[PDB]
Design a protein around this ligand. Sequence first.
Ligand SMILES: C[N+](C)(C)CCO
Ligand SMILES: C[N+](C)(C)CCO
Ligand SMILES: C[N+](C)(C)CCO
Ligand SMILES: C[N+](C)(C)CCO
Ligand SMILES: C[N+](C)(C)CCO
Ligand SMILES: C[N+](C)(C)CCO
Length: 311
Amino acid sequence: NTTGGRFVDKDNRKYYVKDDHKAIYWHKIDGKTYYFGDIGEMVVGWQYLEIPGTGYRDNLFDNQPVNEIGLQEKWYYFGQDGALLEQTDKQVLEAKTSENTGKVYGEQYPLSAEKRTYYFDNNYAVKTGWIYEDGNWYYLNKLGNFGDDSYNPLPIGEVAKGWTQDFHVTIDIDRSKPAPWYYLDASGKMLTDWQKVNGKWYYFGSSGSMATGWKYVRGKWYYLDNKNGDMKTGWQYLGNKWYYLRSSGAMVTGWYQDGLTWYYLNAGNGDMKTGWFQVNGKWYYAYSSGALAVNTTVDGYSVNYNGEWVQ
Ligand SMILES: C[N+](C)(C)CCO
Ligand SMILES: C[N+](C)(C)CCO
Ligand SMILES: C[N+](C)(C)CCO
Ligand SMILES: C[N+](C)(C)CCO
Ligand SMILES: C[N+](C)(C)CCO
Ligand SMILES: C[N+](C)(C)CCO
């Protein structure tokens, strides 16, 4: 807690001077918190700053050495008086834009008439990640917009919409950890179970993560694209074996007739069978294409209209 000082207005800026030295970075002054930057100019409004509390950026004055430290940056909101908004739940505030962030006391900037509901963590920074609100899950952006060299932290903390990947993020993305896919609706609601997006079907389960590969959902087997997740139908060559999935996407087992041709999908895994196989005591022969032989001979041996072997 900083004491023995005084706020001073000068040069269309504001400072906190004690013993004739300017205050810098974070300071607790009389039950309130302020951030005076690198040269002492008090900040107002939306600010993207290193997290306070470590002491490496706290209770410092312009006459002391500033230490090298690797601290994560986060969004904070200060009032027009310079006092930090110590909110830990939610609050409606002016939207974060390209022209109301990083301003100092004295600097006049347009007030965004657009107001948004921002959420805060227990340390007064804008919350990121998942949040539950009225029986639904929303995702607040963990990362800004990336570029070849450009990074815009402005979207951090905003309600995500559409296809969104959830990364493990501290200061940078952790590419060693998984990053599932989610879809937030036109109001940010996380989608669950089966959903049709852009004409194709996707399964999000009960947790919301997009499914990939084979998935057993309510007694049926489905195949979601191994990478893009969209549901497959019809004949599919997966794992060097053949499978037929209905228009509903449900895998087919047993006998199936495509037009006039008969195929047999193995009972267990539904893989198409070839060559000689036996169903309920009787024998059948299926060509390389999986098509069943009917009313013909196979190596001299005869099969009737049902494909059954007739001694
Ligand atoms: C992703 N949710 C927040 C919906 C559940 C935690 O896995
Ligand atoms: C649906 N995904 C976003 C997972 C892939 C399409 O780009
Ligand atoms: C399971 N789906 C919703 C994808 C199809 C139902 O016919
Ligand atoms: C996932 N299936 C069971 C459908 C095939 C693998 O055995
Ligand atoms: C079973 N195949 C997919 C090989 C042919 C039927 O279209
Ligand atoms: C074996 N088939 C399915 C082709 C006919 C049974 O009656």
